[PDB]
Design a protein around this ligand. Sequence first.
Ligand SMILES: Nc1ncnc2c1ncn2[C@@H]1O[C@H](CSCC[C@H](N)C(=O)O)[C@@H](O)[C@H]1O
Ligand SMILES: CC(C)=CCC/C(C)=C/COP(=O)(O)OP(=O)(O)O
Ligand SMILES: [Mg+2]
Length: 277
Amino acid sequence: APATPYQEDIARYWNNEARPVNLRLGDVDGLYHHHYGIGPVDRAALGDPEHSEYEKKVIAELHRLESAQAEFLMDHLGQAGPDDTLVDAGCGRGGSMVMAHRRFGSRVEGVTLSAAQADFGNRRARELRIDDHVRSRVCNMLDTPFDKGAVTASWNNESTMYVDLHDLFSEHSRFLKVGGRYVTITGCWNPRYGQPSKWVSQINAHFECNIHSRREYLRAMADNRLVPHTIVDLTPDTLPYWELRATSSLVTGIEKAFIESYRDGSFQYVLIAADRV
Ligand SMILES: Nc1ncnc2c1ncn2[C@@H]1O[C@H](CSCC[C@H](N)C(=O)O)[C@@H](O)[C@H]1O
Ligand SMILES: CC(C)=CCC/C(C)=C/COP(=O)(O)OP(=O)(O)O
Ligand SMILES: [Mg+2]
């Protein structure tokens, strides 16, 4: 049962979603992501733009940048081991969960509003024989079954724009143990610009999301016992990904809005890593 008419919309969006730009990239190595990439493009791997196999090399390179984004996130989760539980809030098809389990060996619990995504991720976990440690469930990340203080580290990778931040960080704060770690990577509108620009609103309209101001992230964390130890503006680092994507046959139409808004300073891609204290 959906929490709100809006979360019903979001369950529906993601139950229906199945774009080539996500699935073809995932097929590269069975890590299915729904987030963007960071880091320099590997021009040597790409080769000659005129070559017959170029679109496939671009696919492989975009995927590499998306996986690199997740590795950067996990660099900030502190240490974690097989006895620990990690929570992926808004877990998509579960690519980040597989990566986390591989890296840390932890139990990894994911929650998503999409039954299709949860099924897909659990089928993937079974194929990899890691289903005894990695599990996706259909659940509102604002209201989860995890016990108070049970969780060692958790994160939101491009999923914070679908929820009230105070309610979100309240919940992470509840299930994270004292000394626990939280990380988000998000696109937020830059309070320096003043208000959400037209580009930001176009992005909101495209995904049915609600991009928050960087000011709102910091405030919501301060009000919920999450204290940032690292904040990185990844805007420069994600532009190469988007500029390459823009040349791809798998474009979705929103590429210009991300590029222009990143360039004019109205929109930014940030990582915030915080301690639960
Ligand atoms: N209230 C809510 N509760 C649980 N998941 C939510 C949610 N609102 C949005 N989501 C999830 O957020 C995801 C956005 S896509 C990002 C997926 C994943 N974090 C990745 O990086 O690959 C979708 O899985 C969507 O179902
Ligand atoms: C940084 C921000 C504001 C993301 C907005 C929310 C959202 C739907 C991310 C999904 O990426 P995706 O892999 O599902 O979509 P795409 O097909 O455009 O790559
Ligand atoms: Mg994508």
